[PDB]
Each structure stands twice: as C-alpha cells, then as structure tokens.
C-alpha cells in the first residue's frame, strides 16, 4: 500500500450543499478514518457557546440554573476563528478578554399591556414582553470587538428560539459570557445539530425478476431505487443511494432467495447538518484540519522515556 | 440573628454538604393581634439534580436500572439516520424479566413519532389474531423502516457496521428518586457514641457503617481474620 | 416545563419551532404529522421533542406572586 494508491483511488461526490446541511459522499476512504474522521466533527471542532451566566436578577418562574444552560444551548452565528481560547489557569478577571469572550446581556421586564382587548386569551397582546426570545439577547462589544464584529454582529443562530415566558411584574436581567469550547467538552459546542454517515447499500440481484414480481419487488424499496427495465420487464437497481435499507424484501419469501442486501466496502454518505455557526464544508475542513493538526502536533512531540 | 442575652450576632449555617440555592424566604408573622415581630422564617432550598451516575431510571414496564455511565456521544453507536440513542438498555435483561410490552412500546413509540400520531396502549385492545407487532411494524413499513423495527447502525468507536440490525425505539422513561447523592457515606470519626465510644448511623451527621454478626462470621470464615478482627 | 431547546438525540435546535407548531395545528388545522414535517423535522429524534412536548410552564405562569389577582 501507499498514499498514492490511496490518493489515486480516493474520490468525493458532493450530492448537495446548503448553509445548514451538506450531504456528500466519500469513496475509497477507510472506516477507521471516516468514523474517527467523522466524530472529530461531532466533538473537537470548536465553536462559540455561552458559558458563564451572571444573573443580576431572575424573577421569572423558570429557576436560574435551568435558564442558565437553557441559554447555553442557544447557537450563535459567529466565526470561532474570530475568537481565541481561554486559559483556565488565569485569574477570573484575566481569564476573560475581548479576544477570549463574547458578552451577551439580557434585560426584560414583563408588564401587563393595558390595551388588552379584554376577553382576550392571547398573551402577546395581554402582556408586554411576555415571551423571551433568542433574538432578545443583546451583544455587548468589548474593546476591539466593537471593531472586529461590526461586520457580523453576534446573533443567536435561530433568533426565534423561545427562552423564557414572563408574566407582568416579572423580570430577567443577566449577562452571559460566550467562549470557545469543543463539543467533546460539553454537548453545546460542536455545531453539527447532527453529523453521521452511512454506506452505500450494495443491493444486488441474484437472478432476473420481472412480471408482477418486479412490481412487487419495486414496491419493497423506496421509490426510484428499483427501475423496471422496459421490454425486458426485469427489475434493475436504478440508484441504491436512495435506499433506506428497510430489508423489507427479506419478509417476502418469493424474493428472499433472489436478492442479497449489503453495504459497499469503502464509501460513505456524509449527512452533515449545522447549528448555523458554520457551513458544513467549513466545518468539514476543520474536521480534516484538526485531525491533521493532531498528527503534525504529535509528530513534533518528543517521546519521553 | 442577634441575641440579646449573649449580646452576640449569631448565625445559622447550611448543614447539608450538597450545595443548594435560596429558593424562597417566607416571613411569617403570628396571630394574637400583632405586636409580635418576626420570630420565624421558612426557606425553600433549590437543589440541582442531574442524572448522575448511580441514578435509578425505569421504563413504564418495570425495568429498573442504575445509570452505568454517561456515555460519550461519539462512542454511542449511531443510526443509519444519524440518531444516537438517548439510553442503551442491555438486550440480555429480558427473557428473564419477560417484559414484552417494552419491545412493543419500542415499536409504537417510534411508530408514533414518525407519523406524528399517539398510540393507544390500553390493555386487551389486541389479541392473538391481531398482534401489535404485526400492527405497528406495518406502520413502520409504511413509514419506510424495518417492519421489525430493527435498524442498521454503526459502532460509534470502530465506525464499522454492527453485525446485524439492532432494535431501536422510542420508550417513555421515568427518572426515579434514590439518586446516589442521597445514598452514600464514608469514614465516620465524629459521632463516637458516648456510651460505647463508637461511631453512629451515617445519614447526614457523619456516622459510619455497622458490621454485624453475619459480617463478623464471614471474617472468621472468610479468612481475613487478623484484618477482620 | 418549557420547550426543550435542542433535540436530545439529534442535537438539532428544536426550541424555536414550538410557537410556529401550535400555529400550524391552530390556524392551518394540519395533522400532527405534516406540521412537524412542514417544520422540517425529519428524524423522529427531533420529532418527539415537539410532538410529545408539554408546555407546563403555562400552568406555572398562572401563579404570579408579583401581581394582584
């Protein structure tokens, strides 16, 4: 074997890409890698998340610590490349900087709207600021951040995330701190919202199938997977990649001998969504990047006796 | 609370070792026509409870188990779909407990969550002629899953596919009481009961552990005799 | 108590869709199935989050110590 024997054979197919999900395919890469190569993207790809939460006041019905992490789970549209890590050894005052940390403030008082068209259920009209939304979090620039983030001010990736509900007289006033962490550290970093793969379902036919069978056969799979060849009436796999591997055929004895269901060997379908912080390929670079950065780091490490 | 007699400002302190929050403070006056200042307060403490290791959970089917480890999500085998399970219950813990309804619920739970429709579990709505297995899997098939509910998955560590499809479903769980934080203790110096100069029950005052005869007997029979004694 | 922010399994952010979900069932009188599918909930992971959900905070909000009846 050799890298060239790989670099020659390895092949990528991008089925689709979106600012949130990008589904692509990786051919001739080897499960030991792709998996590990995957789960770097579920974990160690760092991203910004609120971490330390300072309540000046919570009068809400939601007790603090809940609303604390309930904020923490809120994604942010931020390029973590614009931020730096946070040393824990530093004293708390020094522990945070403008380069370390993004400050988010939240201030809401709930007041009864006197305009309520009495005989109204709707709390939106009954009350003022009854519902607290992600979009309500205010970004407070610090130092250079005032400059830096003028381009793309910090925003919760899903502005309409419902944080808290409030009744008149109740208020919430807080400041939270956003830092870099890896999903491996805590479940709220890695901006996947999921990441995974699967194998091309190598489905193959052991002997021609036609007549009603092909139709019955074709029905046993997701549509469009099984083409029925016209004029031979026989069934042919159109594309397996659409298959969900229900193994439904295996329930029908007639077809049970006629088809084997399998996965191809080295090939992968990556479905990578995102929390919205980064486009998947942007992440997927860091997936590669980090893994490489492990070795290149470790190669340079002296091996102590 | 300031004391007049001792002319001191004294203090009540938080006894429990587990850090709590101040939830509510209730100023309680008294009857008999006022003139009485505040002599009593009740205080809610809020205590965070998370699913620590050692916390009994259960299904509705009577499967009780201790959380063994919070399991790193990347290591939790992940679906063909990309869904890592929330909970992983050993498949061996069945034939002995003879709980089928959990398998059935595992189907229906999934079956519902797909079609978005609630699934009546009322007993004796089925029969040997119409089984739920036949019933729900039929739905799963129409949903495009394995009629048996089994699913292709991949070992989260290796990444390779597991030997066979494994059986996944959506089951309603119940976190119990009896969290480990409530139950354990160690090394009780403090109490040293006055009569016997011996420790005392652990509870929350710093006791110890009773030995007892059946435990004594073992030492003798166990073998660790010098040690035992 | 209140809408979970993320799907436990998926990790996908489910916290916002609730209001719109009720809106769908309410205004559009959809089924439970389509609305979820229309909200873009594919994995039955993230479907159960909204689907099974209870807003029980609503009952809590009915008790407000900070206001007259």
């Amino acid at each position: 074997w050799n890298v060239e024997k790989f670099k020659k054979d390895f092949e990528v197919n991008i089925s689709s890409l979106d600012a949130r999900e990008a589904n692509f395919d990786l051919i001739n890469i080897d499960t030991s890698i792709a998996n590990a190569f995957r789960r770097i993207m579920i974990s160690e790809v760092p991203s910004v998340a609120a971490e330390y939460v300072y309540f000046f006041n919570n009068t809400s019905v939601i007790q603090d610590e809940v609303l604390a992490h309930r904020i923490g789970l809120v994604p942010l549209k931020v390029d973590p490349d614009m931020l730096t890590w946070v040393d824990s050894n530093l004293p708390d005052d020094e522990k945070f900087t403008d380069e370390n940390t993004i400050v988010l403030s939240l201030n809401v008082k709930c007041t009864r709207n006197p305009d309520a068209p009495k005989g109204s259920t709707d709390p939106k009209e009954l009350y003022n600021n009854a519902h607290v939304y992600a979009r309500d979090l205010k970004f407070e620039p610090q130092g250079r951040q005032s400059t830096t983030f003028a381009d793309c001010p910090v925003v919760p990736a899903d502005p309409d995330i419902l944080l808290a509900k409030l009744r008149p007289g109740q208020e919430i006033s807080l400041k939270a701190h956003c830092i870099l962490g890896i999903g491996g550290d805590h479940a709220k970093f890695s901006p996947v919202s999921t990441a995974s793969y699967r194998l091309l379902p190598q489905i193959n036919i052991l002997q021609p199938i036609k007549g009603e069978s092909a139709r019955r056969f074709q029905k046993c799979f997701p549509p469009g997977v099984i083409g029925i060849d016209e004029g031979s009436d026989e069934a042919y796999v159109k594309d397996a990649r659409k298959d969900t591997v229900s193994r439904e055929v295996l329930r029908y004895e007639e077809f049970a001998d006629k088809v084997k269901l399998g996965r191809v060997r080295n090939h992968f379908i990556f479905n990578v969504e995102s929390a919205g912080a980064m486009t998947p390929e942007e992440i997927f670079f860091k997936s590669v990047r980090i893994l490489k950065n492990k070795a290149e780091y470790l190669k340079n490490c002296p091996i102590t006796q | 609370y300031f004391d007049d007699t001792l002319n001191k400002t004294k203090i009540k302190t938080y006894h429990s070792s587990e850090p709590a929050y101040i939830e509510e403070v209730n100023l309680i006056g008294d009857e008999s026509n006022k003139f009485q200042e505040l002599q009593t307060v009740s205080i809610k403490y809020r205590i965070r409870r998370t699913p620590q290791i050692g916390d009994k959970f259960s299904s509705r089917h009577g499967q009780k188990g201790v959380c063994s480890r919070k399991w790193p999500t990347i290591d939790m085998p992940f679906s063909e779909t990309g869904i890592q399970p929330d909970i992983i219950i050993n498949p061996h813990a069945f034939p002995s407990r003879m709980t089928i309804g959990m398998f059935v619920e595992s189907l229906a739970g999934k079956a519902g969550a797909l079609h978005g429709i609630a699934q009546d579990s009322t007993p004796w709505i089925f029969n040997e002629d119409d089984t739920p297995a036949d019933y729900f899997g039929e739905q799963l098939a129409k949903a495009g899953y394995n009629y048996h509910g089994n699913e292709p998955m991949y070992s989260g560590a290796t990444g390779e596919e597991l030997r066979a499809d494994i059986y996944v479903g959506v089951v309603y769980y119940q976190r119990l009481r009896h969290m480990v934080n409530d139950k354990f203790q160690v090394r009780s110096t403090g109490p040293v009961n006055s009569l016997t100069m011996q420790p005392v029950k652990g509870r929350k005052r710093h006791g110890g552990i009773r030995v007892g005869e059946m435990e004594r007997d073992a030492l003798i029979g166990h073998g660790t005799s010098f040690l035992l004694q | 108590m209140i809408v979970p922010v993320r799907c436990f399994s998926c990790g996908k952010v489910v916290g916002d869709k609730w209001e719109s979900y009720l809106n769908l069932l309410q205004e559009d009188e959809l089924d439970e199935g389509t609305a979820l599918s229309r909200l873009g909930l594919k994995r039955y992971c993230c479907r159960r989050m909204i689907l099974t959900h209870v807003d029980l905070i609503e009952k809590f909000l009915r008790y407000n110590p900070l206001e007259k009846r």
Binding site: N23, R198, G224 | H115, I117, A143, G144, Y145 | -
Partner: peptide, 24 residues
Amino acid sequence: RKDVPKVEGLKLEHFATGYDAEDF
C-alpha cells in the same frame, strides 16, 4: 370483535440522507 383500526393515510416519513418526500 372489531380489530384495532388501521390509521389511514400513512405515507413515507423516512427518507435516506439527502432526499425529500417528493423524490419518491
């Protein structure tokens, strides 16, 4: 006895990664 009523109008909710309902 009346058997458990089959829930009518159940389409495919599940689709392989990177596909929609319409594709099928």
